[PDB]
Amino acid sequence: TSFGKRARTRQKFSKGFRRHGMPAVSRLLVIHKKGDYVDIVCDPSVQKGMPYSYYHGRTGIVFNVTQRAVGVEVNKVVGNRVIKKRIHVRLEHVRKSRCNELFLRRVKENDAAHHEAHLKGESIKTKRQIPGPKPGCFVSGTMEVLEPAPFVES
């Protein structure tokens, strides 16, 4: 086949439908502190600093912040091993990740829950519960008698 920086991009780098024109200003006012997760989505509208195609849609940790760019460490399988790769990228092509935000909420409630016992002797054992089997109750309402259907061609 043929290899180019943007080969097979077509659908992948397409702007979208009715989504043409430049980035909005409020998305350009997002801050990214180092030690923070970000999903690399590249918008073809800006051709400056767009990352390579493989990294598109990859979540990874911000290690640097250049003035007009964000150093993101992502990770990449090469047969036998993962290897952590360090890719700079323009500000428009980075989104804030939302993958961590349940865990970030969770710790504030969970650490405050363990805190507040003190002399009652904590040992709360705070933990999510996976919704397995339901217990039993009586249930009653209006009924219908169904039967199976004869075939019709139409």
Partner 1 sequence: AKSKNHTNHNQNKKAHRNIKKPQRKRKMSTKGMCPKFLRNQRACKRGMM
Partner 2 sequence: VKALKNKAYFKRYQVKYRRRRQGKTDYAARRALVLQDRNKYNAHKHRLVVRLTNKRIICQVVYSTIEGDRVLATAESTELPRYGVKIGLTNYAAAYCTGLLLARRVLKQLGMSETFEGVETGEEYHIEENFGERRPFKVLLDVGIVRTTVGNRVFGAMKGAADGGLHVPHGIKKFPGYSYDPEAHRARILGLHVADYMRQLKEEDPEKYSAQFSQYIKNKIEADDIEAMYKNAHAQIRKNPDAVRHVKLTKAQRRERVQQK
Give me the residues that bind partner 2 (CB under 8 A), please. 18-26, 28-33, 65-70, 91
Helix (H, G, I), strand (E, B) or coil at 99: coil
Closest CB 67 distance from partner 1, rounded Å: 8
Residue 30 binding: pick among partner 2, RNA, partner 1, none (C-beta 5-8 Å cut-off by kind) = partner 2
Region at 134 (left for phi over 0; alpha for psi -120 to 50; beta for the rest): beta
- Residue 82 or 143: the one with the smaller Cβ distance to partner 1 is 82
Q: Are 60 and 73 in contact (CB under 8 A)?
A: yes
44 binds, among partner 1, partner 2, RNA, none (CB under 5 to 8 A by kind): RNA
Q: Which of 29, 82, 112, 152 binds partner 1 (CB under 8 A)?
A: 82
Cα–Cα dist 47/66, whole Å: 18
1: contact with partner 1 by CB under 8 A: no
CA diameter of the chain: 75
